[PDB]
Design a protein around this ligand. Structure first.
Ligand SMILES: Cc1cc2nc3c(=O)[nH]c(=O)nc-3n(C[C@H](O)[C@H](O)[C@H](O)COP(=O)(O)O)c2cc1C
Ligand SMILES: Cc1cc2nc3c(=O)[nH]c(=O)nc-3n(C[C@H](O)[C@H](O)[C@H](O)COP(=O)(O)O)c2cc1C
Ligand SMILES: [Cl-]
Ligand SMILES: [Cl-]
Lengths: 388, 386
């Protein structure tokens, strides 16, 4: 073989330097070149759940610049489980082909790509956040307010959201099968990893939290009952995806009520960090490789933790990681917006960090972090050449 | 109508800089005067655009350059710079480029493409392999088939000696430039640029260093500019009258600024000739000239340099000479918003940036921040700042 090109590592490889952040991480059959992941970040740009060239150019522009793993936004496992009418879906076989075009591009760059499987439950059929932080998408704009579902018939915010329909046991069986089928579709779309969304007040968190889950069947009313649907979904997803495939779960570490004097009185039973630790070990027992630690979402008084400060919920990730040790990988997310902070989080014992907004603000976040840390991390050949 | 506006990304929503003020050419309005300069990606096979080009251009267009000019795109197969260049020499090239213009248009953005021919600098390797070396046939090259006005290699002992274009070859070449322009129109580009710079084919005719012909295409100024004037006429005859037509020139071979190089190359391409040419181009429906420099010789490299605004003065000299008869853009190290605004406030109509966009696709927002103004991004991108 003549004129063989010089071999190069994937973009995102630490070619000079010894930071932990830009050191590789292997989970089962996949090696990520570094531990700075793109967090799932809804784009509100789809019709009928299909990815289009917005998603391809958005994700592709970031993947050119070497995140260790690029996790695609919340992708609904049921049509009625979309957050907005503009969400991605994996509930139709037709969804596979456009997503495959994105994974193909990532793989042309020798990059790793994942997707977050999701269901919004009682927070479904809402409008994009630039229209409202919480308002219904009515049927005339593609909404389905009459068809949203939940563990209990309680609206997210009364007077704003539709009252959800209560899932029956049969409905829960169908839901679990649909989660598994969406996972099978993600595999057919050639994703390298899958994440289950169990956070941010969406359907699985609605079962986890006694604030939203008032059921008295086997899916509510005790810790074992409240985590049951998530544990069952993890088992059934693991049963249908390759054993080589990393399985991630994103959780809300707490409803935050436990940390405020008044809110604890108002909601004396809620989802808490101690329950998250207990849950994390049960997840590890079912083949979940990594848990990403966010927080919030279950109530108007408990927003999704999208905040303005640095590393604002790293401490939850650290408490969980201290409790679980090497039995489970942990990633932190939230305001991890400089290289110094990202490296400090992983040096403290956290296995990886994720950034969401900071990648959309700066698709070259990896190189910014590398520059701050005084190390060299390869970009795409064309991009590195542009610095000449 | 129930449940019913935002301006395009790149619109100055607060502030009064000239840089982020709109510019109208014929039937097209650009929301600002910061353009993405043509920037080869060396990522194509057989001239076809692919998802590298789509994700590269799309990621920049999301962030609102007034006009995104796509890289040198060959009008003949043998006119590619490298075997990895884009082409518009085959109808098959239309649909992949159409996907890119479709995405730009979904963002209400304007997109152009640079039609090009490398002449005696064709069939070279990508620059990270060599600044100048032949792509041999075994790696997709065509050294035996490169063409030029005169049988003189770019660098002797490095580049193949080119075949001399005959009169009939020149007729075919002009028809191929026009056919590529027709294909660019069918791919739904908003604007077209003719590449007449950087030592490539049309500059090879312009400069007496490379053009030693004694037919009607060499040996005098009128003869040396002839092929470019004729190509501009042929292209204008086949594209919409509403379409902006740009030309990129090399302002000079640089030999005129050094006594020894003037002795060694007593006739070369010069700024004064660029001024004369610019007015002839304006007469033929060229709307805007972008001012670069260099390329014709090892002793005259393409001006890709490390300093700020390093050939702004050529653009200013040409703009002073042509006045309102022609629009002028500057390029080269225009890497901060303060500099870009100073350049346009000196009378230049627009500025272009190449490397600085690939380094930072959000260059527009960086420049706007430095200037203390607000320039809209795609809705999703502006939302990510909440
Ligand atoms: C516009 C937007 C969309 C988001 N979409 C998702 C999503 O689809 N899934 C998810 O789990 N989190 C989502 N999040 C939360 C982020 O993944 C992330 O956890 C949060 O923004 C904090 O990290 P950051 O400071 O790096 O952005 C979103 C956040 C924003 C601002
Ligand atoms: C990698 C690379 C590729 C380029 N490709 C082209 C091209 O296709 N056509 C062109 O006219 N100029 C091309 N240029 C020159 C640029 O358009 C630009 O004029 C030059 O890089 C200086 O401007 P800048 O400082 O903004 O990069 C290229 C430059 C580089 C570094
Ligand atoms: Cl979310
Ligand atoms: Cl060039």
């Amino acid at each position: 073989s003549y004129y063989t090109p010089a071999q190069v590592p994937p973009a995102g490889t630490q070619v000079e330097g010894s930071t932990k952040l830009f050191s590789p991480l292997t989970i089962r059959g996949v090696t990520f070149p570094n531990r700075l992941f793109l967090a799932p970040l809804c784009q509100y740009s789809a019709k009928d759940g299909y990815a289009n060239d917005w998603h391809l150019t958005h994700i592709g522009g970031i993947v050119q610049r070497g995140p260790g793993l690029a996790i695609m936004e919340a992708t609904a496992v049921q049509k009625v489980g979309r957050i907005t009418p503009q969400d991605l879906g994996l509930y139709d076989d037709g969804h596979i082909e456009p997503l495959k075009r994105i994974t193909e591009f990532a793989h042309s760059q020798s990059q790793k790509i994942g997707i977050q499987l999701a269901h919004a439950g009682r927070k479904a059929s809402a409008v994009a956040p630039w229209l409202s932080g919480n308002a219904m998408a009515v049927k005339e704009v593609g909404g389905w307010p009459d068809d949203i579902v939940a563990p209990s018939a309680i609206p997210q915010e009364e007077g704003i959201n539709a009252v959800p329909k209560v899932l029956t046991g049969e409905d829960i069986g169908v839901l679990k099968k649909d989660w598994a089928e969406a996972a099978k579709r993600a595999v057919r779309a050639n994703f390298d990893a899958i994440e289950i969304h169990a956070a941010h007040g969406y359907l699985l968190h609605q079962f986890l939290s006694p604030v939203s889950n008032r059921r008295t069947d086997k899916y509510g009313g005790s810790f074992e009952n409240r985590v049951r649907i998530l544990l069952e979904i993890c088992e059934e997803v693991r049963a249908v995806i390759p054993t080589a495939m990393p399985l991630l779960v994103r959780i809300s570490a707490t409803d935050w009520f436990e940390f405020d004097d008044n809110l604890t009185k108002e909601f004396p039973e809620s989802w808490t960090v101690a329950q998250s630790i207990r849950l994390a070990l049960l997840l590890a027992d079912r083949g979940v490789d990594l848990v990403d630690v966010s927080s919030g979402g279950i109530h108007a008084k408990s927003a999704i933790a999208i905040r303005s400060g640095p590393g604002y919920q790293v401490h939850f990730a650290q408490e969980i990681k201290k409790a679980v040790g090497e039995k489970l990988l942990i990633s932190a997310v939230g305001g991890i917006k400089t290289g110094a902070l990202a490296e400090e989080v992983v040096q403290s014992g956290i296995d990886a960090v994720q950034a969401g907004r900071w990648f959309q603000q700066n698709p070259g976040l990896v190189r910014a972090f590398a520059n701050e840390l005084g190390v060299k991390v390869r970009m795409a050949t064309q991009i590195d050449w542009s610095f000449e």
